[PDB]
Design a protein around this ligand. Structure first.
Ligand SMILES: Nc1ncnc2c1ncn2[C@@H]1O[C@H](COP(=O)(O)OP(=O)(O)OP(=O)(O)O)[C@@H](O)[C@H]1O
Ligand SMILES: Nc1ncnc2c1ncn2[C@@H]1O[C@H](COP(=O)(O)OP(=O)(O)OP(=O)(O)O)[C@@H](O)[C@H]1O
Ligand SMILES: Nc1ncnc2c1ncn2[C@@H]1O[C@H](COP(=O)(O)OP(=O)(O)OP(=O)(O)O)[C@@H](O)[C@H]1O
Ligand SMILES: Nc1ncnc2c1ncn2[C@@H]1O[C@H](COP(=O)(O)OP(=O)(O)OP(=O)(O)O)[C@@H](O)[C@H]1O
Ligand SMILES: Nc1ncnc2c1ncn2[C@@H]1O[C@H](COP(=O)(O)OP(=O)(O)O)[C@@H](O)[C@H]1O
Ligand SMILES: [Mg+2]
Lengths: 52, 53, 246, 247, 247, 247, 247
């Protein structure tokens, strides 16, 4: 019946596999650059080619 | 360092794939609408997203 | 389908007249008379002819999961909610819902049924959005609902809502003008279905059909005819083959 | 459009007008079919939350074993079968009004779960470790006398004193004689315009028959009777004989 | 080899001969150990499709959570962990016979799923797009009282009407007394060669004892008794005392 | 190694030796501590398959929802998490003996899953479409009156006749008065050597006390009493006082 | 540390010292607050496993659906969500002692899952086909009376004889009159330093009051009373007035 329980069962589970790296396609160049700047701030091992 | 390196490589791959997809879509669009670039408007063909897809 | 008796003709005319109205319709009678046949005829001639006809029996509904069938549920609402499910009210959206054996419904669940009929809106179990549906209600009963109401075993409001137009179907025991047509129709249908040459019943076997006080009515008649066709070894069916069953 | 002609209904409307500036819980009591939900919607409309959600919930239909999941929601790994987080009705009605219909039919065990949320406004999800604060106004409607239930040990006194800050009592249609004919005319007009039949008004005998019947289903029964009469009328005026659904 | 030396059993055998070439589902009802498996395999053997698979299945051994995956099959990627596509038992017995033992153990949802396929004759894989058509002859056996099951509300009435077109009710062994003696002598030999024990037959007293016991396990209980008698004996004849303790 | 001085146990020993060549399932019944495990292992040792595995299963410790996977196994991809194929306890015990201990504590739903394997030995895996045949002897032990359970609607009447081909009943210790003293010495030599004590026998009054006591735990309780007497002993003999406080 | 002064409590200590070499299960019984866990830990400390794990388990806080997965463990792929192998408490406590606290709260069906592992120590993991042998000493504690519980029928008889090899019963504090004053002084010294008070002892009237109160919570209640007296103390002595709660 309708209830909330913790149990050991054998089930066939569905497969979601998307929404990963999909939001970068609709971003324009400027918003993409802002996202890349945030990622550079948050990750030590990411660097951007510099002109200085 | 391992986690950050893996994330960096994943982001680089994502950017490369985005650029390649944009280039392919643009090339297909230009190939479909070719009488516009030679004679301007009044020679546009009608098309929707399904054709390019 | 075959209708030859004057009572069946009157019921057919009444069904033709009432098909336009969208009021809930109740049908009563003995077992195996054709209540579902009348309901499907009403649905066919109604303005919802192309709409779904969702027929369900409430006798097979478990007591403790009735709501899960009444409203449906979303994914992950409880244990065993693997995927989204639609209740019978949502299934018949725009169509006609046929509740068979309404007289055996428990008292507590009855109060939970008409509450959805009058309001017309409900929430799916685990769903946060409101659902509005329109359904034409056909109900079937085998006993006398009025006597149940007088015994306190039924809701009077539900009777009033369902009993806007009620129909009584005479049992086959008092429809002796249909015995031969039904027997011949079933004989030909099953003979074609099983691909064996059986022409028709003998004169001796015909009187056995009338002499039999059919208790299962059309269902029993169809089963007996089908079994007689299955064991038939000649184009003429004698009374000896039928006497084995009866 | 709603009909309020009896002096008691006008007094109730004036009380709603006066309390339109309050966020207290409201408790509505009466018989079945008298208009508790109509009064609740009127209270919501006249208040300052008129542009906010109005969540009507019948607490007598939710299964007992999944009561907290419906009211409070859950997280991803709360139990076997939970795959994603889902909000409850309290969080759905955040910033608006929550109407609880048939609060008396709630079991004595289920009344204990609502104690803290009504006053504090804070709770935890099923499987959540963060406190959620919401701003919801509670309207509750019941047909049973809550005071008798509390006096006989069937309704918790804590919940009764939490809810009944303001109490509204709706007299039955049997005691509203002045409020029968206008409602009958309104229903007649609505059903004539909806079912596309032809009818304009009742005869004097029909008016007397309507006024003499002790309506026990209240406005619900009146509406059903008028609908049936419209469905079974073909002239222009409904006579006493057609309105034979009564006794 | 089997034993059919009772008038009821001979009539059932004639019915089997008449029916074995038909194309309708068969339902076999009886007590415990009456010979339902024997009847099913005899129906399959004396059939135009006797060279085709006879898939015998126990409906109580299939878990609910994967039920429709076993009976119909699934495609690759239908669910997480689906390595490769797999067929169901309906396709496995395509062109042959599918026997369902103890059909009364089915659940309501499984009953509806089976009814759909029995009616239409075509189904779909769990994660498939094309439609599969099969030519399976369905035999189902049970020992419950199916009428009481449908009256109680455990077996779907339409499913029973679909399956219960042909009923074969094997009478209990206590009503087949003239079949008891040929059965025992059938078993006594079979075990005598099997266990190498030397024994010829039963004495008159033992034969009289055999006909008087109201067997509750029917043929299986008689087989067990004869096996015990053969094991716990060394003489050429089995007498009253040897079977007295067993009975 | 064991003690079988009582004639009622000598008859059981003769019966066990008499069924060495057989392979039919055996059902063992008795009270607690009477020696069902000893009888089962002795039957296994004296048979022709003594070199084969003896798989003992406590059927009450198998979870309800994974019962089919344990007794039958599965193929890879049968469900979410079947990353590799597995073999059940019927395939593991192939060629040997499977001993179901405390089979009377089996739910009515789980008893119907063993109806076809015990008879024929053919089954399918979970997700397998090819039949698997095994050669397994089945011994079952229970401490409950199986006939009373069958007639009380707690144990299926088909499984009883499938299992109960040969039934062995072990009398309680209150009836095996000729084993109390041979056992009491036995356990004594087991324990005084284990704990390096100096006890070598019982006095003439402790033996009478042992004989008079109505052992309700049977041989297990006798073991416990003897171990307690040995642990708290001082001297070369155990007198009446050293165990009168217990029994 | 602990205080044992009453003559009936020194016999328990002598028995504990007597069973140092043993490895049989121990069953501890007494009222609430008499020191069952103290005795269990003292038994563990004086044995040969004193440097081994002491796994104290409350068997009343293990869900019944995953019970078998907690005491035995599971293999990879046993069920959906089993992504790695995990051990149980029996294997975690291997080489040491497992202390089941409140063994009398187990349900009848949950007691049948412990029958074959207490005696032999061999079991199969969920989804495992290889047997596992462990060396664990079983201590069990309960505040009920297991003998009369078995007589009534709420405790299995075949588990009581497995657990109860050696039984230790602790008398109530109202019978250990020689322990009241030493325990009171011990607790006063313990609590006068944690809270940095200036109390050093009791008065004669306070001691007379302490000897007449029928302690229902036993040592736990005495400890609570002494803590209350210390917290609200002003002088260097605790007078009978400060112990007014014991009147
Ligand atoms: N006039 C008819 N001509 C041919 N077949 C008919 C006719 N009336 C009924 N039947 C047959 O009778 C059988 C039973 O019909 P139906 O299920 O509608 O009856 P019922 O048992 O009284 O109804 P319910 O179980 O839905 O309350 C059907 O197989 C149908 O084909
Ligand atoms: N005529 C016969 N001659 C010889 N053996 C027979 C005969 N009829 C039945 N048997 C034997 O009876 C035994 C049990 O019969 P069967 O396998 O058909 O049981 P069943 O009716 O399906 O049982 P259950 O209802 O318990 O599932 C079989 O081993 C079979 O060999
Ligand atoms: N004849 C015997 N000689 C020696 N020891 C015996 C004898 N019969 C029984 N025992 C002892 O009895 C003890 C109790 O366990 P036993 O094997 O009798 O289990 P049971 O109560 O019959 O059933 P189960 O173990 O299957 O739950 C065993 O430790 C065994 O050594
Ligand atoms: N002899 C003693 N000396 C000192 N303290 C003691 C003594 N006996 C008991 N205590 C104290 O009594 C308190 C409660 O006792 P304990 O928890 O051991 O008993 P219990 O209620 O029987 O146990 P449980 O319910 O946890 O199985 C503990 O804090 C313990 O320190
Ligand atoms: N004053 C009114 N004017 C118009 N309609 C009304 C009035 N009072 C009640 N009704 C009608 O009666 C029906 C039942 O009233 P409602 O408050 O919804 O349920 P209940 O009062 O039984 O909880 C409603 O559909 C409503 O339209
Ligand atoms: Mg069978």
């Amino acid at each position: 019946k309708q209830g909330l329980q913790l149990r050991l069962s054998q089930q066939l589970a569905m497969t979601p596999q998307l929404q990963q790296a999909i939001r970068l396609l609709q971003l324009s160049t400027l918003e993409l650059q802002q996202e890349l700047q945030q990622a550079l701030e948050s990750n030590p091992l990411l660097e951007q080619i510099d002109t200085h | 360092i391992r986690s950050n390196l893996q994330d960096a490589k994943w982001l680089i791959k994502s950017l490369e794939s985005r650029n390649d997809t944009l280039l392919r879509v643009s090339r297909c669009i230009v190939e479909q609408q070719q009488a516009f670039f030679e004679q301007g408007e009044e020679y546009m063909k009608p098309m929707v997203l399904a054709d390019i897809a | 389908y075959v209708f030859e008796s004057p009572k069946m003709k009157e019921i057919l005319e009444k069904i033709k007249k009432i098909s336009c109205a969208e009021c809930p319709v109740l049908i009563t009678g003995e077992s195996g008379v054709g209540k579902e046949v009348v309901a499907r005829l009403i649905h066919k001639l109604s303005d919802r002819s192309k709409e779904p006809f969702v027929a369900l029996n409430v006798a097979s509904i478990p007591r403790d999961i009735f709501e899960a069938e009444l409203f449906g549920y979303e994914k992950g609402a409880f244990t065993g909610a693997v995927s989204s499910k639609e209740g019978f009210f949502e299934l018949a959206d725009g169509g006609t819902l046929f509740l068979d054996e309404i007289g055996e419904l428990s008292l507590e669940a009855q109060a939970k049924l008409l509450r959805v009929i009058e309001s017309g809106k409900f929430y799916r179990l685990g769903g946060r959005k409101e659902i509005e549906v329109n359904v034409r209600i056909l109900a079937a009963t085998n006993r006398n609902i009025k006597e149940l109401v007088k015994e306190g075993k039924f809701r009077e409001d539900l009777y009033y809502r369902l009993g806007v137009i009620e129909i009584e179907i005479p049992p086959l025991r008092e429809r002796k003008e249909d015995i031969i047509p039904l027997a011949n129709h079933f004989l030909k249908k099953f003979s074609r279905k099983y691909a064996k040459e059986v022409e028709g019943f003998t004169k001796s076997a015909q009187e056995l059909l009338l002499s039999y006080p059919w208790y299962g009515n059309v269902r029993e008649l169809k089963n007996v005819i089908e079994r007689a066709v299955l064991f038939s070894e000649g184009k003429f069916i004698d009374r000896g083959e039928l006497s084995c069953l009866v």
